[PDB]
Amino acid sequence: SLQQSPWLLRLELDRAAMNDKDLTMGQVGERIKQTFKNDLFVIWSEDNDEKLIIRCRVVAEEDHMLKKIENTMLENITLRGVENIERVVMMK
Amino acid sequence: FDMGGYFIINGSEKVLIAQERSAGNIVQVFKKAAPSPISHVAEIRSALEKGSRFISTLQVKLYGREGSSARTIKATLPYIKQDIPIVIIFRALGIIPDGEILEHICYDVNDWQMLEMLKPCVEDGFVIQDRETALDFIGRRGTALGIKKEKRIQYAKDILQKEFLPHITQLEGFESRKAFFLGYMINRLLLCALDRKDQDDRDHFGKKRLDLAGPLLAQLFKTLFKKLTKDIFRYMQRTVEEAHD
Amino acid sequence: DESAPITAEDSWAVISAFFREKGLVSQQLDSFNQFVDYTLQDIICEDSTLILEQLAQHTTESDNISRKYEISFGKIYVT
Amino acid sequence: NEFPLRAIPKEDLENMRTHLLKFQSKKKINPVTDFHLPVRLHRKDTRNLQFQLTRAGNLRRKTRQLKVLDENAKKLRFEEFYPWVMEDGYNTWVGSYEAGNSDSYVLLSVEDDGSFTMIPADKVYKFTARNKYATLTIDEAEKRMDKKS
Amino acid sequence: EESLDLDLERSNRQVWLVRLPMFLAEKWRDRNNLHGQELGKIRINKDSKITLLLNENDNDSIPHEYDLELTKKVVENEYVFTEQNKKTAIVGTVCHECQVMPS
Amino acid sequence: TLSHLRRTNTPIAKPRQLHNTHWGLVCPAETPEGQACGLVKNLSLMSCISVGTDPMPIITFLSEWGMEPLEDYVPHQSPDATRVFVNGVWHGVHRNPARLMETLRTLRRKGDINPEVSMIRDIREKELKIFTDAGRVYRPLFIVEDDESLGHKELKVRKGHIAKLMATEYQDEYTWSSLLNEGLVEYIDAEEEESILIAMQPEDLEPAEADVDPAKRIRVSHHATTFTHCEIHPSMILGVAASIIPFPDHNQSPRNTYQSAMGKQAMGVFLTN
Amino acid sequence: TTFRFCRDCNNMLYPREDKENNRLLFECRTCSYVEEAGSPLVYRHELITNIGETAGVVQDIGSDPTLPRSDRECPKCHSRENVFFQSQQRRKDTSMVLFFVCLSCSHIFTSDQKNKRTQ
Amino acid sequence: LPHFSKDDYSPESKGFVENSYLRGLTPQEFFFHAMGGREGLIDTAVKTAETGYIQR
Ligand SMILES: [Zn+2]
Ligand SMILES: [Zn+2]
To answer: Could you tell me which residues carry Phosphoserine (chain E)?
Structure first.
């Protein structure tokens, strides 16, 4: 309120993890949306809402297609930071 | 006060030193390092208690890394160049339908986690559907190749009987035993990859054996007696040719 | 009171018995003995027997004679 | 502190004009005799004979040039598979003798007089749909003759 | 009558039999049976305990009770067929499997 | 001469380090310095090595004691089934391992099953592995049983056996074999060690609390009510050379490792002949 | 997840969409078998797992002498007799939370003072 | 060690030698000190050739 695939990719994010590496559902979703452009329809649960969810749909044969999309998503989608740079400690 | 425990060879005393080796017939799972196609391996150093001692080590390989799609399970069989997808091996063994195959690997029908991990293997072995076609597929991959249809299917039979899991039995009708074992191995391979069990401690003393004066002489006497046995045969030919008594 | 719990000094009475029986090189001797009394026989019996077969040309006498000779290994002795 | 007991005399007859065998079917093949009406159980002699190559001055030949002849091998009549044809169109099973040590399960059968008679199991055969079996190749036939003897 | 026909009488009147694993030493004593061929008694006590005991003459020995361990014959279907001195017949279906334990 | 007849060679993960599994089996101090350091092991005083027995009497025993053979296994029917192995050969499964394990243990402690045979029951993993196998290093430990009419969990061996032995010590009829067949003491290899729970001292680590000397070292407690075995003597963890070191518990770790190398080069009477 | 097999083949089932009636089925790729789906969920990944924590809790758990005991009163039978262990999920991350198994009622209770369980 | 209960992260279990050399070490303290002691002997042994070649 204020055409697409019947197959849904639904992922649950960890509130505790989403905080230590400061992130918003909005900004996470934005990365996915900006990665797959107009060939993936993304919706997401609000930062307020109890469970943290991202609902995704594509634009015969679709099962394997989505299993590739979830691998791209977990392994290739960079949210924050610079590549090769892990564990950043603050030091006085 | 002299305590014995040595030999006297040409007048000097000699002590056999115990040699430490890794115990055989032992299932061990190890994570194969960061740059590798295979993420984890199930190894079994199968050898006979006595009799020739076939040092054929079976590797059950989990292809694909933690975060790679199509994580298949293949196994390198003695005298076979390629690693055969587990499924085809079970089929060549006689365990033909999926789920009958899955029953040998996963023991809990509830455990969806391990079962999803077996779906790729089922897809990999989907091509081969009967026992015969499984043995041909194994027979195709030589050896050398050994061209002829009757020949390759007959060869697969022999490898599974004589070179595959030689402890247990090297006898004929024991497919059921060797299938459940392979399934116990895949169970252990997946159990470690699912982070439920720890990688095997290669340095646990319980997994090491000490070859003392006994077995050392036994190892030597074997190769020394087969040296004599096959020199008598060379004589029986020489003395049957000329009937030289 | 022959069923009274054992003290710490008593563990030495057991250790005394362990060594009275086994000695300091039980491993070396017990291994060799096992090899002489048992292992040796089984090594003579695994491959053991060897045969040679002489099958003829089946033409005519002195052909058409097929033979098989055996050589067998039984008990093993050691002086 | 109370038990109901039934006791039966057991005889082991040295007399006997029969041999008792076991016919075993796998649960997966779902065998139900109720559907049976007529059955034919006959031995399989397809592999009656079998010719196997056998190895036959001068130096002994290298393996690549060894000389061979052939030998006829006779299968024990008792070492032949059984062939079960049920209902004329219908089911057909092949029974293969179980490979085992010289020990045998006893069959306990009830007699009209009420006592049990026990007999040694002569042979144990595993029967499975013929569709699971294929024309024995020379290799398999040879491998079979060996197992049995 | 017609050769090859498996006389299904035993299975048609649904006769049932027991398949028992017997220790070799016990079956060897049974071999010494004479008279009517009797060797002992099979006891079934319920409240279920099944056991076999040799008779006094056959045992020549102190009395013992061989317990039976009942087992399932589920994973498959077992039947008994006999071959006379030449007729073939399915005399019975294994209704119970058990192991006679040494004692 | 003694320490040479107890020497171990290891040819070729982290082999040189002293592993926990080396407890009571190999000397923690007797090892060379340089190149061969930690690859040349020296056997502790009470260590023995399994000669290798026959598996069949045990396979025959197992089947007879409730062991369903693998040839007839149906995983979903018996899903909690304890899988039974004899020398890495899976023979079948068993429904009540608790009772089987006790029978097998009584078989060994009687002598019916050889004492050099190793049998382990990993409850969590639902497995029972048996080893008739040659080459396994074992050590003897005192058996402790909850079994005592009068009170707690107490070490089978009593002051009566002790005098029964010292009677035979004065004769130079009650041997080490006598303690072994009377099931007072047992042989435990490293794999079996995994499933047991050992007390260091018997007396000090048995009856609970119902001033204290300051000069003595700080010691822990007998909190365990689970104790299956007791240590004959903790000093037995040491090999021939380290066993001549006076107060090795008062030296820095390597200084001990040094002495168990030097004493081998010390002069004296080697043999009376 | 929890998946089914084909009755007739025993071979596994592959999902097929019935485009016409907009519903999920499971087809057998060895025979002509088809069956409607029980749940809409076909695949579950699970990265932050909790399945492994209370593994191998055979009723014989009390017979392990290697296991430590505590006088913690049970939530069910209130028995101060129990054996304890840590998350058997052999991962690096893993918390040092303890799982107590009752030596009477067999109920698995934890020491977790951040969260509340049922496994 | 087999003298400890499982999942024991106590100082006494993970190798804390509470005692002075003057007082003496418990068998557990003795073996743990022995493990720790062996580590140094290993690097002393190895370093020796690694260090030598660096020099060259
Ligand atoms: Zn199907
Ligand atoms: Zn409770």
So the answer is: 3
Rounded distance, CA E100 to CA E26, Å?
9
Can you give the C-alpha Rg of chain F in angstroms? 22
Q: Indicate whether G54 and G71 sit together in one domain.
A: yes
Q: What is the CATH number of the domain that holds G91?
A: 2.20.25.10
Query: Which tokens is G10 given?
Result: 């025993």
Say how many CA atoms lie within 13 Å of D2 toward its Cβ. 0
Task: Give CA angle at E62 (E60, E65), nearest 5°.
Answer: 110
> Do G117 and G59 lie in a common domain?
yes
Cα angle vertex C34, ends C29, C39, to 5°? Answer: 140
- The pair of structure tokens assigned to D136 is 């024995």
Query: Which tokens in the block code for residue A21?
Result: 């590496």
- Residue A36's CATH number: 3.30.1360.140
Distance (Å, rounded) from C-alpha F203 to C-alpha F152?
13
Q: How far is the CA of G11 from the centre of ligand 1 (A)?
A: 6
Query: Residue H21's closest CA among F248, D108, B65?
Result: F248
Q: Among residues C38, F133, F191, which one has the least CA distance to residue B49?
A: F133
Please name which ligand lies nearest the alpha carbon of G74.
Answer: 2
Regarding chains D and B, contact by 3 or more CB pairs under 8 A is answered as yes
Q: Are residues G41 and G78 in the same domain?
A: no
What whole-number distance in Å separates Cα of residue A27 and Cα of residue A33? Answer: 10
> Is-contact E15 E93, C-beta < 8 A?
yes
Q: Is F237 helix (H, G, I), strand (E, B) or coil?
A: helix
Closest CA to G58 of G85, G94, G30: G85
Helix, strand, coil tally for chain G in percent (to 5) = 5, 25, 70
Q: Which residues contact F110 (CB under 8 A, 6 or more apart)?
A: F181, F183
Phi and psi torsions of G84, nearest 5°: -135, 155
Q: Is B97 within 8 Å of B110 (Cβ atoms)?
A: no
Using a CB cutoff of 5 Å, list residues around ligand 2, an ion: G 74, 76-77, 79, 102, 105, 107
- Quick one: which H or E segment has residue B202? none
Least Cα separation, residue G95 to chain H (angstroms): 13
Is the minimum CB–CB distance between G58 and chain F shorter than 8 Å?
yes
Token pair for residue E26? 């016990």
Confirm if G16 and G6 have CB atoms less than 8 A apart: no
CATH architecture of the domain with range F52-133: Alpha-Beta Complex (3.90)
Question: Hey, which residues does E81 pair with through a beta bridge?
Answer: D21
Going by the DSSP 8-state scheme, the letter that residue F94 receives in this structure is E
Residues in Cβ contact with F144 at an 8 Å cutoff, skipping those fewer than 6 apart:
F153, F154, F155, F156, F199, F227, F228, F229, F230
Residue F222, SS3 per DSSP: coil
The CATH number for B118's domain is 3.90.1110.10
What residues of chain H lie within 8 A of the CB of F192, using their CB?
Answer: none
Q: The domain containing residue G81 runs over which residues?
A: 46-119
Tell me which amino acid residue B173 is.
G
Contact between F70 and B176 using a beta-carbon 8 Å cutoff: yes
Alpha helices in chain D (DSSP H): 138-148
Alpha carbon distance A61, A41 (integer Å): 18
G72 with G40, same domain: the answer is no
Contact F10, B20 (CB under 8 A): yes
Provide the domain limits for residue B62: 25-201
Using DSSP, state whether F11 is helix, strand or coil: coil
Q: In what order do the strands lie in the sheet with F40-42?
A: B208-211, B18-22, F7-9, F40-42
Neighbouring-strand partners of residue G10: none
C51 to chain D, any CB pair closer than 8 A? The answer is: no
Do G9 and G60 fall into the same domain?
A: no
Judgement on whether residues G74 and G108 belong to the same structural domain of the protein: yes
Minimal Cβ distance to G22: which of A6, A63, A67: A6
Exposure string of F235-269, with b = 16+ CB inside 10 Å and e = fewer, is: bbbbbbbbbebeebbbbebbebbebbeebeeeeee
Expressed in Å, this structure's resolution amounts to 15.3
